[PDB]
Amino acid sequence: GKVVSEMIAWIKSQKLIAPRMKDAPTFYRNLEEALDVRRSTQSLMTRGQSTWKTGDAIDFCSNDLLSLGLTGELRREFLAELARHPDFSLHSGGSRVMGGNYDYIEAVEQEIADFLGAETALMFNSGSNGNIAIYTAIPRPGDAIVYDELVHFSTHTGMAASLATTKVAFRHNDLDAFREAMSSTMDSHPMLQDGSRSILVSVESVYSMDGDVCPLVEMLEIAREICPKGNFAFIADEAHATGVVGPRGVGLVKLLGLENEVAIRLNTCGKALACTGSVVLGNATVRNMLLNYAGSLVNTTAPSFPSVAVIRAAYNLMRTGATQKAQDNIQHLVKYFFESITSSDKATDLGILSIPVAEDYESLDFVTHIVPIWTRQKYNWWLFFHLQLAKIAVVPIDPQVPGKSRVRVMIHAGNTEEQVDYLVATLCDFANEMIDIEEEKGKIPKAAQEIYALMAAH
Amino acid sequence: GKVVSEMIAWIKSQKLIAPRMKDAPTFYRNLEEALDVRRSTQSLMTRGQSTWKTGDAIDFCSNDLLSLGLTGELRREFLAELARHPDFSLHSGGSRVMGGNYDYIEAVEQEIADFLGAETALMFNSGSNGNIAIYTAIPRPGDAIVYDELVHFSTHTGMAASLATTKVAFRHNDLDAFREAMSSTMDSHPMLQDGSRSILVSVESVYSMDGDVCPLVEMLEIAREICPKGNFAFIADEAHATGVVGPRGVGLVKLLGLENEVAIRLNTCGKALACTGSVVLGNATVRNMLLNYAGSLVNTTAPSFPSVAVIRAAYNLMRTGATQKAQDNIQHLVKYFFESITSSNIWDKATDLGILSIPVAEDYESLDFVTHIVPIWTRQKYNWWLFFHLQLAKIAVVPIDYPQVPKGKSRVRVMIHAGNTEEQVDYLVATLCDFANEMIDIEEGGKIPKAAQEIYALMAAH
Amino acid sequence: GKVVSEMIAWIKSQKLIAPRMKDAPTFYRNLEEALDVRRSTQSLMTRGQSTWKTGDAIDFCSNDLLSLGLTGELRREFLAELARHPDFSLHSGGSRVMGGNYDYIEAVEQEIADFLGAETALMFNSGSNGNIAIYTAIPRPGDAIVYDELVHFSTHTGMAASLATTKVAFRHNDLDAFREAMSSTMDSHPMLQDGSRSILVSVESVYSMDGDVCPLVEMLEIAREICPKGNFAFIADEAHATGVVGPRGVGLVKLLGLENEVAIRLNTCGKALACTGSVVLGNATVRNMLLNYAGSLVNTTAPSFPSVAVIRAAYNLMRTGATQKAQDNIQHLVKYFFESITSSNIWDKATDLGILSIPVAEDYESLDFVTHIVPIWTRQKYNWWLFFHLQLAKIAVVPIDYPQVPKGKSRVRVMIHAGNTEEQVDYLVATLCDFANEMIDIEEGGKIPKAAQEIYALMAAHA
Amino acid sequence: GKVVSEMIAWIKSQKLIAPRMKDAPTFYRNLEEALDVRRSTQSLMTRGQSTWKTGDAIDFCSNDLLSLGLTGELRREFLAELARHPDFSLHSGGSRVMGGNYDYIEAVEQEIADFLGAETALMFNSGSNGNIAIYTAIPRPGDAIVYDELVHFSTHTGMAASLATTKVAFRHNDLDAFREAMSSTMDSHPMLQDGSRSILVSVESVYSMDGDVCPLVEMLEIAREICPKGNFAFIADEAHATGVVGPRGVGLVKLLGLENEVAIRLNTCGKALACTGSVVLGNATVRNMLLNYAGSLVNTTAPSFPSVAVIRAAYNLMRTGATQKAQDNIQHLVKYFFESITSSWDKATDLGILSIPVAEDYESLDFVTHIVPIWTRQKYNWWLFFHLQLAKIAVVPIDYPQVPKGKSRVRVMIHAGNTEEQVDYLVATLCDFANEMIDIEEGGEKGKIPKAAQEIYALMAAH
Ligand SMILES: C/C=C/C(=N\C=C1\C(COP(=O)(O)O)=CNC(C)=C1O)C(=O)O
Ligand SMILES: C/C=C/C(=N\C=C1\C(COP(=O)(O)O)=CNC(C)=C1O)C(=O)O
Numbered sequence A: 001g002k003v004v005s006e007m008i009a010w011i012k013s014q015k016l017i018a019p020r021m022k023d024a025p026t027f028y029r030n031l032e033e034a035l036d037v038r039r040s041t042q043s044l045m046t047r048g049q050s051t052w053k054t055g056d057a058i059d060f061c062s063n064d065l066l067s068l069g070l071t072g073e074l075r076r077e078f079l080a081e082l083a084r085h086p087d088f089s090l091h092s093g094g095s096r097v098m099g100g101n102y103d104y105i106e107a108v109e110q111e112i113a114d115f116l117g118a119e120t121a122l123m124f125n126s127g128s129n130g131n132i133a134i135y136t137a138i139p140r141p142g143d144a145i146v147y148d149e150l151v152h153f154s155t156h157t158g159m160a161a162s163l164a165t166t167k168v169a170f171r172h173n174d175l176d177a178f179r180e181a182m183s184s185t186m187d188s189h190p191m192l193q194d195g196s197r198s199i200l201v202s203v204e205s206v207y208s209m210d211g212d213v214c215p216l217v218e219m220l221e222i223a224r225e226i227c228p229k230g231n232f233a234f235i236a237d238e239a240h241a242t243g244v245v246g247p248r249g250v251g252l253v254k255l256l257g258l259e260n261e262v263a264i265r266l267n268t269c270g271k272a273l274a275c276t277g278s279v280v281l282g283n284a285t286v287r288n289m290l291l292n293y294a295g296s297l298v299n300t301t302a303p304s305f306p307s308v309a310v311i312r313a314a315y316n317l318m319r320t321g322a323t324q325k326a327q328d329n330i331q332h333l334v335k336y337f338f339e340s341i342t343s344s345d346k347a348t349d350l351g352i353l354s355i356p357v358a359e360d361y362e363s364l365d366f367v368t369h370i371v372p373i374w375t376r377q378k379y380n381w382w383l384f385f386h387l388q389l390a391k392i393a394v395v396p397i398d399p400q401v402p403g404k405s406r407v408r409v410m411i412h413a414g415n416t417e418e419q420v421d422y423l424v425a426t427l428c429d430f431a432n433e434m435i436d437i438e439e440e441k442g443k444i445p446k447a448a449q450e451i452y453a454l455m456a457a458h
Numbered sequence B: 001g002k003v004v005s006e007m008i009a010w011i012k013s014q015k016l017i018a019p020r021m022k023d024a025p026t027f028y029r030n031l032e033e034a035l036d037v038r039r040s041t042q043s044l045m046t047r048g049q050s051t052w053k054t055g056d057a058i059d060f061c062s063n064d065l066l067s068l069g070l071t072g073e074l075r076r077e078f079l080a081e082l083a084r085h086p087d088f089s090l091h092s093g094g095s096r097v098m099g100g101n102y103d104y105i106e107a108v109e110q111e112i113a114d115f116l117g118a119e120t121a122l123m124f125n126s127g128s129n130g131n132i133a134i135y136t137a138i139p140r141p142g143d144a145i146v147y148d149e150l151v152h153f154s155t156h157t158g159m160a161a162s163l164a165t166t167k168v169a170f171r172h173n174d175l176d177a178f179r180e181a182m183s184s185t186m187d188s189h190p191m192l193q194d195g196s197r198s199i200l201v202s203v204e205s206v207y208s209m210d211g212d213v214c215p216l217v218e219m220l221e222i223a224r225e226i227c228p229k230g231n232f233a234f235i236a237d238e239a240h241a242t243g244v245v246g247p248r249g250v251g252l253v254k255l256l257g258l259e260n261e262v263a264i265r266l267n268t269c270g271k272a273l274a275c276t277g278s279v280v281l282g283n284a285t286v287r288n289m290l291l292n293y294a295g296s297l298v299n300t301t302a303p304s305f306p307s308v309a310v311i312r313a314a315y316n317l318m319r320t321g322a323t324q325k326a327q328d329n330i331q332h333l334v335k336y337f338f339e340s341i342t343s344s345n346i347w348d349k350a351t352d353l354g355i356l357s358i359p360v361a362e363d364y365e366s367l368d369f370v371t372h373i374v375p376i377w378t379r380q381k382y383n384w385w386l387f388f389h390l391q392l393a394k395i396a397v398v399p400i401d402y403p404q405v406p407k408g409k410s411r412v413r414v415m416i417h418a419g420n421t422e423e424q425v426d427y428l429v430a431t432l433c434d435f436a437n438e439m440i441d442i443e444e445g446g447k448i449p450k451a452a453q454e455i456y457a458l459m460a461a462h
Numbered sequence C: 001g002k003v004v005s006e007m008i009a010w011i012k013s014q015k016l017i018a019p020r021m022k023d024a025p026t027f028y029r030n031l032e033e034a035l036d037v038r039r040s041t042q043s044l045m046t047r048g049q050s051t052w053k054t055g056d057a058i059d060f061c062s063n064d065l066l067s068l069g070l071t072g073e074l075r076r077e078f079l080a081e082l083a084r085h086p087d088f089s090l091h092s093g094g095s096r097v098m099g100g101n102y103d104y105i106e107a108v109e110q111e112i113a114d115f116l117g118a119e120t121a122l123m124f125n126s127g128s129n130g131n132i133a134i135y136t137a138i139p140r141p142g143d144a145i146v147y148d149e150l151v152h153f154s155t156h157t158g159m160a161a162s163l164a165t166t167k168v169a170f171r172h173n174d175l176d177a178f179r180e181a182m183s184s185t186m187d188s189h190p191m192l193q194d195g196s197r198s199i200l201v202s203v204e205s206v207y208s209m210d211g212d213v214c215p216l217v218e219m220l221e222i223a224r225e226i227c228p229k230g231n232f233a234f235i236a237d238e239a240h241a242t243g244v245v246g247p248r249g250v251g252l253v254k255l256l257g258l259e260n261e262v263a264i265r266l267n268t269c270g271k272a273l274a275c276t277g278s279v280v281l282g283n284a285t286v287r288n289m290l291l292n293y294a295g296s297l298v299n300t301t302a303p304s305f306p307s308v309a310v311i312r313a314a315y316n317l318m319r320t321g322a323t324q325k326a327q328d329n330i331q332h333l334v335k336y337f338f339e340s341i342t343s344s345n346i347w348d349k350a351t352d353l354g355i356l357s358i359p360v361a362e363d364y365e366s367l368d369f370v371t372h373i374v375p376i377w378t379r380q381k382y383n384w385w386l387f388f389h390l391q392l393a394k395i396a397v398v399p400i401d402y403p404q405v406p407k408g409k410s411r412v413r414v415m416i417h418a419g420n421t422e423e424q425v426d427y428l429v430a431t432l433c434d435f436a437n438e439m440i441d442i443e444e445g446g447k448i449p450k451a452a453q454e455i456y457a458l459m460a461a462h463a
Numbered sequence D: 001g002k003v004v005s006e007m008i009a010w011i012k013s014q015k016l017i018a019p020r021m022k023d024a025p026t027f028y029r030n031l032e033e034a035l036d037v038r039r040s041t042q043s044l045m046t047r048g049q050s051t052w053k054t055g056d057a058i059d060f061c062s063n064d065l066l067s068l069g070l071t072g073e074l075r076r077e078f079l080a081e082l083a084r085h086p087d088f089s090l091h092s093g094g095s096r097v098m099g100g101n102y103d104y105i106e107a108v109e110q111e112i113a114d115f116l117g118a119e120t121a122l123m124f125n126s127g128s129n130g131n132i133a134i135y136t137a138i139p140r141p142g143d144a145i146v147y148d149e150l151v152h153f154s155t156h157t158g159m160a161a162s163l164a165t166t167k168v169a170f171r172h173n174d175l176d177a178f179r180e181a182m183s184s185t186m187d188s189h190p191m192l193q194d195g196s197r198s199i200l201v202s203v204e205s206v207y208s209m210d211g212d213v214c215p216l217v218e219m220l221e222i223a224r225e226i227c228p229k230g231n232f233a234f235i236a237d238e239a240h241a242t243g244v245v246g247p248r249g250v251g252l253v254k255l256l257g258l259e260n261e262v263a264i265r266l267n268t269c270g271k272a273l274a275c276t277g278s279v280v281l282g283n284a285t286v287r288n289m290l291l292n293y294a295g296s297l298v299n300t301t302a303p304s305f306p307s308v309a310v311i312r313a314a315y316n317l318m319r320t321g322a323t324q325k326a327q328d329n330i331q332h333l334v335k336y337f338f339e340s341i342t343s344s345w346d347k348a349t350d351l352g353i354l355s356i357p358v359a360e361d362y363e364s365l366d367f368v369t370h371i372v373p374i375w376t377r378q379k380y381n382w383w384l385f386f387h388l389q390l391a392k393i394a395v396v397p398i399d400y401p402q403v404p405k406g407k408s409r410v411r412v413m414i415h416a417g418n419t420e421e422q423v424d425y426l427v428a429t430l431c432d433f434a435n436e437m438i439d440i441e442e443g444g445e446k447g448k449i450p451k452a453a454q455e456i457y458a459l460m461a462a463h
C-alpha cells in the first residue's frame, strides 16, 4: 500500500533523534534538537505526499488546477515552443540588468502583459520571489502597508524587509475592518494626510487557505473615500486566480475591469499554469523600480530559455482558448461538490464538520477550486487520516497557521463527478463516526485506530 | 555601431524624471524620485549590455564559463534528457514538502550528491534562494556567524533574517582577521565557550568579486584550534568553483578532500553549468532542517521536471568528462593573459604610477590553479574611461560600481571563458596596453583620453 | 420568434474560434485570438439588432429621432431636391481644395450656416470626421485642451493626433471640476498665462451617453474669469441637439444665443436629420484652418451631389417648420414617460433598493426642456437580465456596455422618438415595472428572473 | 475670364492677415498666424479650381477617370436604382454594429466582393476612412508594417494609430529595397522569426502621385522567401486601379490573379467610380476584426440607402460591361499622349527643364495608367502650372504641404472623355513652355520670367 507505506515513513520520521545525539558535534546536535521540536508535535515534514500523482489516491490535493500537467498538454506545447526555436540560447549569461537580458524574455513578458491587460511584465523565478521583490523594492520611507491578515508567507517576509514605516493587518476580507485600518492609518501620518506618501494595499485575489475572493471593487471605493488625494496603490497577488478566474483565465483583476486601478499585480505559474515562475505586472515606473531596487533580482542569474518557453507555453494555451473548457470544468465540479455535501447539517450544527465556502454558494457569481474543510482541532489529523486511508489525497493545513488547523481539498478540471461522490460519501462516513463517538473521550475513530496501530507497530 | 546605440540608450535612461511627474499620483511620483536618486549618479540599470550575445563584442563579461551555453552543448544534452522521458509529468503539483515531491528530483539530487561527495542534496531555483534558506533555517538562537566581508548579497539577505544573535565579518581572505574574529567572538560568548552553540563560518570558495580562492584548509585549522570542543561548522558558497575547479568540475571542497569537513556547501547552476538553480549539500540533518525551517522553501512551488532535467544535463556533461577540455582551456587562457600582460613594457610603468593594477596576477606562477575572474583596477577617476575604452574596442567586460560596491571602489571584471581564444586575449592585452600608454602620456605632459572624449561628445548630444 | 433568432445568432458568435485556427496562417490566427478576447466577455459585435426596423420590436433604440426616416418624409424631400436639379453633376471630381469644390455644396453650406446663426459651414461625411478634423487642424503647439470626460470617441481620436501639448479631462458636466481643470492648466503653463496660446474647451451640447445638457453659460463665465486675457475657445459637439433642441431644431448654442461666444460647433446629420454627414460651423478663419491643416479633409474626395442634396433636404424640413410638431412630440412623450414611471407604486421601492435608477428623470419638471435620451440603470449583475427582458417583451432598447464604457458601468439607453406613441410608452413603463417587481420579489424571497431563465436555456442549447 | 478670376482670388488669398489681427483674440490670431505660414509660400488652399467642370478649361486634372460623372451615366443608373426601390428606408438608424445594419447594404457589399473576387466586403464612407480602419484595427502588438514610402496620407495616419511596434518604409517600387526591408525586419524580431507575429506589407496598386504600378507578383515571391513560415499579409490600396486596370475594371489584384494571396484590399469610389465611399475586401475574419476593433466604424452612423445605391450603380456599370469602352479609351488616349510628347523632348529632358518618368519605355508596358506626373525645375513648377492654366488647360499642382518642398510637380489626369485634339493641344502647350524656358536659361538673365508668369506677377502687382 503506497498510502500506508508513506504513513510508516511519516511515522518513523517523527521519532526523536537527539537522545541518540550525545556524542555528536554541537552543530548537528542543535539541528536535530530543533528538528525534535517539530517531531514532538509530530509536525515534521520530510517527503510529503506523492500518491496523488502515481494514481494510488484520488487527487483532491494538488495545485494542478487545470490538469495541464496530468494531461501532458502543457508539456506538448512546451516541447513544440522549443522546436520552433531550434538554435535557442539556453543560458541567460548573468543578471537581468548586468548582461543577462535578451529579446525573447522581454517579448514573452510583453506578450503576457498584453494578455493580462497590463503595460509591462517582469519575470521572476517564483511567486514568492516576486512578492519578496515587490515589498523590498516598492515601498518608500513614510509609506504605510495595509494588508489582509491572510496574505502569503512571502508577502510577510517581504514587508519585514521593507522601508515602510507602518504596516497594519486587517480582518480577513472584512470591508469594515479595511475601512477602519485605512482611516486610522490616514489619521496617524501627516505625510499621508497631505498626500506626499502612499498607502499600499496588499490583497490576494483568491486566498490560498480559505478559497474566498477579494471584494476588490468595494475596497477600491473605500480607498478613494479615505484617500481623496489618490495617494494609495493596490498590490494584488493572483497566484490562485490565473487560469481559474476570469475569461480565458485572465484573473480577477482583469475580469473586474480593474487593470488600470491596480498598481501592481502578481501572477504566478505554480498552480493552474502547471510549471514555475511568476510575473509582476505594472507600468514602466514599477518595472524600473524592481530592476533597480529588488536586490534579489539584481544579484541572481536571469532565467534560462526553457524556463521562459514553458511559461510562454502556458500563456499560449490560455490565449488560444485551450484552457477554457478545463476552466469551466473546475466551476462545474466545485459546484457539484457543494450541491452534494450540503444535501446530505447536524455535524455542522455541532461543530464536527464545516465548509465555510459552501455557505450561500448559490449566490456566488463563481466559485474557486479551494475547499477548506474544518473539523474540531482535536479531530483534524483523524479527518486527514480518514480521507487518506480512503485513498483520497488532501493537504493537511497546520507551522503554516496558528488551533487553526484544517484540511484543504483542491478540485481540479481532471477530477470526475464519481470521485466527488466518493469524497462526499467518505466525508459523511467520517462525520457520522464522530457524532457517534461524541454522543467516551478515549474512543478513537476507525482510521486513527489503524494509524495508532502502525505507530505502535513501528 | 551597436555599442554606440546601447550607450546612447544608457545615457538617456539617466535623465531625471521627477520634473515631468508633478501631475502624477503620489505612488508614481515617489517611485520616479527614488529612481532619480540612481539616475543622478549615472547608476540606473535597465537592459544591461547585450553586445556579447550578439557577436558585436568579444565576451569577456558573461558567466557562461565553460561556454556550454554558447556551443549548444548543454541545450543538446538537455533535449536528449527530455527525450529519455517521453511522457514526463511536467508539474510538481505544489511545495516540496506537500504534494510536490517526486522520484526524478530526489534521484537527480542524489546523483549530484554522490558525484560531489555529499550525503544529500536539496534543490533550489537559484544560488540566492539557497543562501536565503541556509541562513534563515540553520542558525540557532545563540549561534554566531563569522563571515568573510565579501560573501554574496544573498548571504547578507540571509544572515539579516537569521535567528543568530551575533554576525561578525572579517577582512577578506585574511587569516589573521579570521583568527581575530573567531577568538573575540568565542571569548565574548559563554554559550560558545561551554560548547552549547556553534560558530558558523561563511566563505566563498571562489570570490566572484575579487577572483581569489578561500584558504579553507588553513581556515579549518584555525577553527578547530579556537573551538576545541568542535562547535563550529563551515558553509562554503561554491558558485564560482563548480565546473572551473577540481576533477570533472567538482569544486574546491572536494578538490581538497574536505567534503567531510564542510557541513554545508552551495553549488549553483547560473555560471559554468549554464542554466539556473542550485543545490545545498549536507547530511540528512541539514537537509531536513532546510525542509522544515526554511519558510522560503516550504511556501514555494517545487521545481518542474524540465528545471531538474537541465540541471541533471549540466552535471551529466561534467560527470562524463565532456567539460575537461573546457576547464583546462580556462586555466590556459588565464595564464596566457597573465603572461602576456605582465610581459608588456608598459606594465611596470603603469603599475608603478598607479594607472593599472591587476592584483589577481601577482605571483600567478606559484598558484596551483587560477580562476576565470580577472578584476582590473585603474584610478577611480579613470574607471569609466577604462570601461568605455574597452567597449569602444568591442570588448565586453563587466563594470563593477555602485550600487554593487561602495562609491570610490569601482573596477572592471574581465571574465575569461573556455570559448575565448588567444587572439581575443591578445587583442584585450593590446587594448589595455594602449589605454595604459595613453594615460601615461596624459599624466607626463585638462586632457581627457579618447574614450572619454567619445562619451563626453555622446553626452553633449544626448 | 425573431428576437430569439438573433439571440441565438449572437450566442453562437461568442463561441471561441482560436482552438479551430491552429493550422491557419499566423495573420489569421492572431486576428481570431484578438476576436476571442471580445467573445470571451460576450462582447463581440457582428450585425447588431434589427427588430426595430422590421416591426418585430417597438423602436426605443434607434437614432431616427424625428422619425424623418420612418415616415419617408426625408426620402420625399430628397428626391424632390434631386428633381429640381435634373442634370446634376454627381461626382465632385477630387479633394475639396484640389478641384472638387463646386457652387451647390458651397451654397448649401451657407444656407445651413445662416439658418444656424454662424458665419460659414464646412461639410464632412460624418460627425466623426468633423471631430477628427477639428482636433487635428485647430489646436496649436502650446495650446491646451480641457475636455469633458464624456466627449465622443471621435473627439478622443482627434485629440490624440492633435498638436496640443496638454489634454486635461474633467468630471462630467461638473462646474467645480471644470474650474479646477481650467485653473490648474492656467497655473502650470506660462504660455497660457501671457496669452500667447489658448485653452480649448471641448463639450457636447447633449451628451449621447447620459442625456444631460452642458451648462454652457456657466462654463463660459468660468472661462472668462480664469482666462482674463480672453485666450480660450469653446468647441461644442451638437450631434444629439440638432433637430431636438431649439426653435426649428437649431440646437443648444443658438437656443442659448451663444453663436458669437462659441468658436466652433459640430452639427451632424446622423440622428434627427436621418442621413449621414456633418458641418463644422465657425468664421472664415476657422474654416480656412480646416481646409488647410486638416489632412483628413485635404486628402479625401469631396462629397457627391446626392450627399449634399439629402443634407439640404433635412435642413429644408427644419427651416420650413415641418419638424416642429415632431420635435414637440419628443418633449411630450419623454415628459409622459417620466410622469408614468415615477408614478408607479414600485418606483420608490425600486429606486430606494437600487433596483432601478433613471438619473435624468429626477426633478425633470424644473428643466426648461428634456432630451430623447433616457438611460436606465439596474444592478450591474442584473443589466443583461433587464436588456433581455425588454427584448423578449419586443421592446428594442440600446445595450450600453464594454467596450463602449468601462466594465461595471453597463446600463440601458432608451431612445424616445417623435414617431413613438403613448401606448408604446405605457407598455414600456409596465414592462419596466414588471422587471422591477420581479427583482424585488427575488431579493425579498439562486433565483434568477424569467428573462435570465430564457437566456440561460438558450446558452444551454447553444454556446 | 473665370480662369483669370480664379487667379485673382487665389492671389488675394495669400495676403498675410495676422498683421491686421493685433487686436483680435489669441485663438483667432494664432490661427491666422498659422494660415500666414502657408500664405507666405503661396501655398494657402481655399477654393481649388472648378474651370475643368464648367467647360472654361480642358479637364486634365480631375478624378472622373471614366467620365461617368461627365456623361451623366452614373447619375442615370443611380436614379434608376433608387426607382427600383420605391419605399427605401433612407436612414441607417445608427452604428453598423449596434442597430444600423440592414439587408441591402450587406447584399450590395457581397455583390461587390463577388465581382472583385473577394470573400467579403465592408463599406466605408471614403477610401481614407477605410485605410484608417485597416491600420487601427488590423495590426497586432508585435507585428511589423513594411510599407512603400509613397503610400497614402490616410495610411500614414492609420499606421501612426496602430498597435504595431515596427514600421519600416522602403524605396518606392524598388524590389531590392523591399527585400532589404523585409530581411532586416525579419532578423530584428524573434516573434517574427518564429512565426508568432506577422509582417504586414502596405502598397498601392496604382500610386496617385507617380502613376507607376506595384510589382505585386515579385513582391509576394520575395515575401515568401523571406518569411518561409508564411507569417505575412499584403494590404493593397486600389484607389486608382478600380475601373481603370483589369478586365471590366476589377483592379490590379484580380487582373494578376492574386485575390487569394492578398489578405486585405481597398477599393475606393472617389475616382473612376465617380462618387464617394470605399470597401475593404477580405475574409470573414478580417471583416469581423474591422467591425469590432475599428472604433471609427463602431462609433459612426451606418451608410444611408442612397450612399449605398450610388456605389451599387457604379458596380452595376462595371459588371454589365458599360465602362469597358471608356477604360479602353483611357489606354488609347494615354498612349497617344506618350507617343506625341516623345516624338517632339530630348533636349528639354536632357537639360532638366521637363521630365515625364512614366513615359520611359511606355511601349514595353503591359498597360498604362491615367496618372501623368510632369516634372520641371523646382524653381519653374508654378510657372508650368500658370502656363497650362492660362492656356485653359486644367491640371493639379502638387507641392508642400502634400509632398516635400523640393519634390513639386504637376499631375495630368487623362480621362476617357478627353479627345485626341485636346491631347494635341496639351502637347503643343507643353512644348511651348519647354522652348521658352530653354531660351530664358540660355539667355543668362536669372531675373527673366516666362510669359505666363508675367501675367500672374502682373495680376499680383495690381490687386
Ligand atoms: C507551493 C505552495 C503553493 C501555494 N501557494 C503559494 C502562493 C504564493 C507563492 O508562489 P510560488 O513561489 O509557489 O510560485 C504566492 N501567493 C499565494 C497566494 C500563494 O498561494 C499553495 O499551495 O497554496
Ligand atoms: C547574476 C549574477 C551572478 C553572479 N553571482 C552570483 C552568486 C550567487 C547567486 O547565484 P544565483 O542566484 O544567480 O543562482 C551566489 N554566490 C556567489 C558567490 C555568486 O557569485 C556573478 O556575476 O558573480
Ligand SMILES: C/C=C/C(=N\C=C1\C(COP(=O)(O)O)=CNC(C)=C1O)C(=O)O
Residues within 6 Å of the ligand: C063, C125, C126, C127, C128, C129, C152, C154, C204, C206, C207, C208, C209, C237, C238, C239, C240, C268, C269, C270, C276, C277, C278, D094, D095, D096, D298, D299, D300, D301, D302
Ligand atoms: C452611429 C451613432 C452614434 C452615436 N453618436 C455619434 C456621435 C458623434 C459621431 O457622429 P457620426 O460620425 O455618426 O456622424 C459625434 N458626437 C456625438 C455626441 C455623437 O453622439 C450615437 O449613437 O449616440
Ligand SMILES: C/C=C/C(=N\C=C1\C(COP(=O)(O)O)=CNC(C)=C1O)C(=O)O
Residues within 6 Å of the ligand: C094, C095, C096, C298, C299, C300, C301, C302, D063, D126, D127, D128, D129, D152, D154, D204, D206, D207, D208, D237, D238, D239, D240, D268, D269, D270, D276, D277, D278
Ligand atoms: C481627394 C482625392 C484624393 C486622391 N486620392 C485619394 C486616395 C485615397 C483616399 O481616398 P478617398 O478618401 O477620397 O475616398 C486613398 N488611397 C489612395 C491611393 C488615394 O490616391 C487623389 O487625388 O489621388
Ligand SMILES: [Cl-]
Residues within 6 Å of the ligand: A292, A293, A294, A295, A298, B403
Ligand atoms: Cl539594490
Ligand SMILES: [K+]
Residues within 6 Å of the ligand: A119, A259, A260, A261, A262, A263, A282, A283
Ligand atoms: K497601470
Ligand SMILES: [K+]
Residues within 6 Å of the ligand: C050, C053, D101, D102, D103, D104
Ligand atoms: K433589414
Ligand SMILES: [K+]
Residues within 6 Å of the ligand: C125, C307, D125, D126, D276, D277, D307
Ligand atoms: K459618404
Ligand code: NA
Residues within 6 Å of the ligand: A117, A118, A119, A259, A260
Ligand atoms: Na494597461
